[PDB]
């Protein structure tokens, strides 16, 4: 795994997610995704469905990085 997947980078991720206040104990991938997407919900995402799409796709990407870092549990 390239330098972007070690426990250091993963630490930065966890730090980031705790700073955003989206990460919580016993959390699942999908839960975290909804949380990340809820934080960027507002004017741009409602008035523009595509930005809404982008938002959720990023949230999805981050929750996945989080899952690989073992920050959140796999879906059931």
Ligand X SMILES: C[As](C)(=O)[O-]
The residues that touch ligand X, with contacts defined as CB under 6 A, are 23, 25, 70-71
Measured from the CB atom, the residue of 3 and 26 that comes closer to Zn ion is 26
Q: What angle do CA 13, 16, 21 make, to 5 degrees?
A: 125
- Minimum CB–partner distance for residue 23 and ligand X (Å): 6
Q: How many CB atoms lie within 10 A of CB 67?
A: 18
Nearest to 30, CA basis, from 64, 68, 5, 53: 64
Residue number, 18 or 42, with CB nearest to ligand X: 18
- List the binding residues for Zn(2+): 14, 25, 41, 50, 53, 56-57, 64
């Amino acid at each position: 795994l390239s330098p972007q997947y070690n426990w250091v980078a993963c630490g930065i991720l966890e730090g980031g997610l705790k700073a955003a206040g989206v990460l919580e104990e016993g959390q699942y991938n999908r839960e975290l995704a909804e949380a990340i997407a809820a934080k960027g919900e507002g004017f741009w995402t409602t008035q523009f469905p595509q930005i809404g799409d982008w938002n959720e796709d990023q949230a999805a990407a981050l929750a996945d990085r989080a899952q690989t870092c073992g920050l959140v549990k796999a879906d059931t």
